[PDB]
Amino acid sequence: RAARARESVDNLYWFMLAAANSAPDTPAFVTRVRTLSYRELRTRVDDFAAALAELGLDVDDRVVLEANVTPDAVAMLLACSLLGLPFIPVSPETPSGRLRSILDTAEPALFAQAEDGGRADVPATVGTARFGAGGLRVERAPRARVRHRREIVGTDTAYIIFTSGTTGRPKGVVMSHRSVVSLYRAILEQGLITPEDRIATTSPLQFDFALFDIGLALGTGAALVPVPREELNWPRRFLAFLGDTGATQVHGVPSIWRPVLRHEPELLAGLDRVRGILFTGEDFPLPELRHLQGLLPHARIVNGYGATESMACSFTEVPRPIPSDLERLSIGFPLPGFDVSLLDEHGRPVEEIGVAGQIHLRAPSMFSGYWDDPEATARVLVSDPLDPRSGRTVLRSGDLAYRGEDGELYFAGRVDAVALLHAFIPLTVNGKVDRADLATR
Amino acid sequence: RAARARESVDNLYWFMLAAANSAPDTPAFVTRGVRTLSYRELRTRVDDFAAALAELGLDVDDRVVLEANVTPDAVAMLLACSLLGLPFIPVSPETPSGRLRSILDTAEPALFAQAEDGGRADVPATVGTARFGAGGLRVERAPRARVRHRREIVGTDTAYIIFTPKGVVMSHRSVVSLYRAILEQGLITPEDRIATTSPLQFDFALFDIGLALGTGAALVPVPREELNWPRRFLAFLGDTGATQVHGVPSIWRPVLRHEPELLAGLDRVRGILFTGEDFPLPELRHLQGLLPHARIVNGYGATESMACSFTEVPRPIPSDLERLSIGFPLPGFDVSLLDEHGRPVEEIGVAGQIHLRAPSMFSGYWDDPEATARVLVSDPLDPRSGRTVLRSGDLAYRGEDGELYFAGRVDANRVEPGEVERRLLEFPGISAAVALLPVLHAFVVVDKAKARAFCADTLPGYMIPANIVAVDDIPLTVNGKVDRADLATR
Ligand SMILES: Nc1ncnc2c1ncn2[C@@H]1O[C@H](COS(=O)(=O)NC(=O)C[C@H](N)c2ccccc2)[C@@H](O)[C@H]1O
Ligand SMILES: Nc1ncnc2c1ncn2[C@@H]1O[C@H](COS(=O)(=O)NC(=O)C[C@H](N)c2ccccc2)[C@@H](O)[C@H]1O
Numbered sequence: 029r030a031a032r033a034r035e036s037v038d039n040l041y042w043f044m045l046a047a048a049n050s051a052p053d054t055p056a057f058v059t060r061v062r063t064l065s066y067r068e069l070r071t072r073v074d075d076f077a078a079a080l081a082e083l084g085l086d087v088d089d090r091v092v093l094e095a096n097v098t099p100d101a102v103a104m105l106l107a108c109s110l111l112g113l114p115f116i117p118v119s120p121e122t123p124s125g126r127l128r129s130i131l132d133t134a135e136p137a138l139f140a141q142a143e144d145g146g147r148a149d150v151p152a153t154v155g156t157a158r159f160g161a162g163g164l165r166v167e168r169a170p171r172a173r174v175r176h177r178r179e180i181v182g183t184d185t186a187y188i189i190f191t192s193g194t195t196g197r198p199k200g201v202v203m204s205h206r207s208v209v210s211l212y213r214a215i216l217e218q219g220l221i222t223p224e225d226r227i228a229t230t231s232p233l234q235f236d237f238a239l240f241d242i243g244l245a246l247g248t249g250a251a252l253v254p255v256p257r258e259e260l261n262w263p264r265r266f267l268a269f270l271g272d273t274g275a276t277q278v279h280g281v282p283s284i285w286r287p288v289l290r291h292e293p294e295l296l297a298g299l300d301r302v303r304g305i306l307f308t309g310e311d312f313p314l315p316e317l318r319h320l321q322g323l324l325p326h327a328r329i330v331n332g333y334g335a336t337e338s339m340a341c342s343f344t345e346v347p348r349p350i351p352s353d354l355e356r357l358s359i360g361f362p363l364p365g366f367d368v369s370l371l372d373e374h375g376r377p378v379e380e381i382g383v384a385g386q387i388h389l390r391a392p393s394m395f396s397g398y399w400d401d402p403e404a405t406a407r408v409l410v411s412d413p414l415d416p417r418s419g420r421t422v423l424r425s426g427d428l429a430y431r432g433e434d435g436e437l438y439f440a441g442r443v444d445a446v447a448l449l450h451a452f453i454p455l456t457v458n459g460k461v462d463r464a465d466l467a468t469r
Numbered sequence: 470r471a472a473r474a475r476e477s478v479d480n481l482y483w484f485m486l487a488a489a490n491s492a493p494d495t496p497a498f499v500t501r502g503v504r505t506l507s508y509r510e511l512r513t514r515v516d517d518f519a520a521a522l523a524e525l526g527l528d529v530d531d532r533v534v535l536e537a538n539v540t541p542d543a544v545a546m547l548l549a550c551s552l553l554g555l556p557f558i559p560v561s562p563e564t565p566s567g568r569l570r571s572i573l574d575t576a577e578p579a580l581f582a583q584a585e586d587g588g589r590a591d592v593p594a595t596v597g598t599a600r601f602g603a604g605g606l607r608v609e610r611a612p613r614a615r616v617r618h619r620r621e622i623v624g625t626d627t628a629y630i631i632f633t634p635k636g637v638v639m640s641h642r643s644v645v646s647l648y649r650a651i652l653e654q655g656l657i658t659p660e661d662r663i664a665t666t667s668p669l670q671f672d673f674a675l676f677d678i679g680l681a682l683g684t685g686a687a688l689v690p691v692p693r694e695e696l697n698w699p700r701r702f703l704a705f706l707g708d709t710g711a712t713q714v715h716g717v718p719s720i721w722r723p724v725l726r727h728e729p730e731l732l733a734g735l736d737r738v739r740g741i742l743f744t745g746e747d748f749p750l751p752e753l754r755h756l757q758g759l760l761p762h763a764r765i766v767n768g769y770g771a772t773e774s775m776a777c778s779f780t781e782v783p784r785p786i787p788s789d790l791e792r793l794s795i796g797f798p799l800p801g802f803d804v805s806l807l808d809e810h811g812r813p814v815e816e817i818g819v820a821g822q823i824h825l826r827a828p829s830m831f832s833g834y835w836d837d838p839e840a841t842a843r844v845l846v847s848d849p850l851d852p853r854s855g856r857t858v859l860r861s862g863d864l865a866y867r868g869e870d871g872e873l874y875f876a877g878r879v880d881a882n883r884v885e886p887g888e889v890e891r892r893l894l895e896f897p898g899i900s901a902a903v904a905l906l907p908v909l910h911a912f913v914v915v916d917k918a919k920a921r922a923f924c925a926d927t928l929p930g931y932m933i934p935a936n937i938v939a940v941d942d943i944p945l946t947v948n949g950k951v952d953r954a955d956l957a958t959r
């Protein structure tokens with residue numbers, strides 16, 4: 029009786045598990061060294077979907093998935109996907125006060141955590157479950173409800189990413205199945221990755237960088253290599269992990285390299301299997317970037333630029349070697365089927381090389397809105413200033429950029445705007461500079 | 470310097486000419502003796518038109534009015550506008566100059582294009598002008614010089630705007646999404662020949678062109694001249710080898726009155742598709758009886774989503790059937806019936822307003838954000854997500870299997886005129902019935918006082934037509950719908 033996305037409708041289930049039909053016995057995950065096959069992953073998703081369907085949740089009903097990137101956590105989000113149940117990924121590190129704030133806003137039907145999970149006292153108004161290879165064990169069944177939705181569509185919400193927005197307000201980026209799949213399709217077209225690759229992923233699941241890495245790898249028929257968040261503090265254990273698992277690509281915010289470059293630059297030079305590194309989140313300090321390049325000279329580095337509101341925007345290979353005169357890394361060209369206007373303060377095109385204007389993004393991968401915040405949505409998703417009467421929307425990015433002589437882009441910071449407004453690093457759960465931490469001094 | 474949609478971007482050019490790569494030598498068009506145009510020949514025409522259009526320096530989002538009916542050249546033009554991200558505004562040559570000039574003033578296009586033999590002249594100096602045909606695209610007045618500011622064409626770029634002054638803006642990604650949904654349903658194969666009857670300014674034409682070319686089937690444009698005369702129309706369908714015939718219900722009315730024996734003789738016709746309005750059931754049952762080896766499909770939807778549902782009519786049609794079903798939305802489409810408070814109607818037989826979730830949704834009404842905010846709204850089942858649904862302005866109820874039934878516009882002591890006109894059908898000899906509203910006149914295709922008494926039986930006094938007029942045919946709009954307005958005057 030539960031609704032299920034059809035094979036022909038944009039949906040993470042069908043997008044990520046297509047490799048179960050071409051190459052069922054190929055590795056989807058590498059853990060520690062154990063592989064999990066595409067077929068094994070599909071069975072786990074189908075088992076979780078069968079248990080989830082029993083609960084009587086309507087399409088658009090929200091499941092909080094509290095977990096790090098694990099084979100089980102991905103099986104759960106793909107089982108939420110097939111049933112049109114939007115997943116809200118939460119890091120176990122998240123303090124209980126912030127979870128309870130997301131539970132109050134998002135009003136989910138169910139909170140799901142790993143079998144060995146430590147979260148207690150989730151409110152009585154929300155259902156609770158635990159997942160493992162054992163299956164999905166319900167602790168408290170979700171409320172009785174009448175199912176109103178007959179059919180799952182590609183514009184249905186896949187996931188909501190919750191952060192504290194720039195005011196106090198909880199920021200919930202609502203992303204449709206069709207928006208995410210569109211990003212995955214665009215980046216597959218680039219051909220960064222092959223089925224023979226093993227993607228070491230470092231981001232927490234509540235960061236769409238993790239959602240990028242999962243989709244990129246499974247979409248391609250490659251293997252995902254979740255790096256346990258613990259091993260990242262311990263540079264020798266981190267390099268040992270990448271070596272032992274045969275990781276060919278390492279994805280993470282710039283932060284993940286700082287401990288390794290200070291304490292174990294000799295051992296990093298020893299990872300001969302690594303063909304590629306990908307980063308996003310913030311500027312890669314150029315001294316650390318030139319150091320990292322020097323230590324793995326046969327490894328392509330990709331600068332990934334974009335926001336949660338579109339998942340991503342551009343992927344530019346860092347010049348090898350980095351020019352000795354280079355001021356700034358290029359964020360290159362938007363992906364095929366993506367487009368940027370640089371507009372001045374009045375929304376007029378900037379058409380001078382070297383002059384910064386606000387990025388306005390046209391993309392197939394656009395968010396649907398900010399959870400319960402239509403004012404904020406109307407200030408970010410706006411009438412295209414180059415076509416204001418059509419009703420077409422663009423993303424008013426709040427990011428500045430300028431163009432070089434071949435039309436490539438350069439990030440020039442926030443229009444809101446380590447130095448602060450003083451000169452100084454404490455990291456956010458996502459691996460960013462905790463600028464709010466440093467500003468309290 | 471001119472931007473061109475890439476092969477990986479949702480775009481009518483790449484969607485409709487995909488068959489040029491798989492089956493270049495297969496027929497894209499059948500015209501009229503009887504000539505085919507191949508997918509390869511069509512594509513070369515599109516590329517030639519795109520090269521001429523690119524010369525003009527138009528930016529992406531700049532509008533081209535395409536005044537033409539469905540022809541090989543008119544389709545080459547809209548596919549050349551598509552590749553260059555130049556939204557096309559289709560206008561029928563039979564549109565009065567009053568209404569064209571109204572579209573040109575609101576749309577403020579960069580270019581007006583018409584056929585070489587085209588009958589338009591009176592075009593403002595602020596708009597460029599060109600003529601397309603054999604040989605190519607002749608510019609008469611070059612459009613204004615401008616700076617090209619858009620670097621790259623994207624799937625959310627406007628493919629076309631349909632004007633009625635109401636402008637439905639439709640993205641490339643929205644249309645292609647409809648084409649993909651209906652391809653999934655497998656209505657048509659590459660062996661088929663689709664006779665299309667709609668004017669190009671009606672998205673039914675845009676439906677038929679994309680359905681056929683998307684599939685790798687052949688399009689058979691029926692010129693309006695061939696359509697008006699029943700035996701000419703059937704001789705055209707026969708001579709071209711049409712296997713599917715698409716049009717509003719009215720394309721069958723002359724043929725069912727004057728030439729039912731000849732219509733029964735179209736053995737190559739495997740399928741008929743209609744939309745626009747209710748097919749009066751007596752004419753529908755007659756048509757089905759005459760071609761029993763032809764599947765009949767009811768297409769339901771509005772321009773705001775191109776379409777919504779495609780339901781095969783029961784074979785044979787029950788003689789006691791009250792209303793034909795608009796069935797289930799396509800895969801990836803979904804309907805709620807909501808009450809006046811946006812509350813789910815969950816009682817069989819109770820009418821509520823259709824709210825549609827679809828991958829094919831319009832971007833907005835040209836220059837009308839107030840109207841856009843009244844039609845494209847917060848999902849009332851999910852108001853906090855920001856997901857938008859189409860407030861359709863169409864009433865409907867469900868049967869026991871969840872199938873839908875159109876119950877009229879919410880526009881339409883209140884008088885439900887679908888209920889007046891439907892109970893006039895039951896009276897014998899009435900094949901079709903318009904009712905309109907001060908006094909309720911009803912006009913019927915086939916004395917009075919028995920039709921009236923037959924009404925007085927099963928209807929309340931205020932829903933009893935004061936005057937019932939027999940007619941030969943119903944006056945049609947350019948798009949082929951009942952001309953309510955025309956009847957109102959007489
Ligand atoms: N390559 C950059 N250089 C420098 N500043 C940057 C850069 N990529 C973002 N940023 C900054 O970070 C913001 C985005 O923050 S976010 O919304 O949390 N999203 C992300 O951090 C990453 C994004 N979801 C993503 C995921 C996967 C692949 C690519 C991109 C941008 O608006 C920039 O201000
Ligand atoms: N099959 C119907 N029975 C009964 N009332 C109907 C029906 N199809 C529309 N309608 C009515 O006509 C309205 C839509 O009119 S429209 O916007 O001009 N669009 C069309 O008529 C054609 C539509 N775009 C289309 C094109 C191609 C394939 C399918 C559908 C609906 O809102 C209904 O009021």
Ligand SMILES: [Ca+2]
Pocket residue numbers: 414415528529530531
């Ligand atoms: Ca423009």
Ligand SMILES: [Ca+2]
Pocket residue numbers: 086087088089850851
């Ligand atoms: Ca709901």
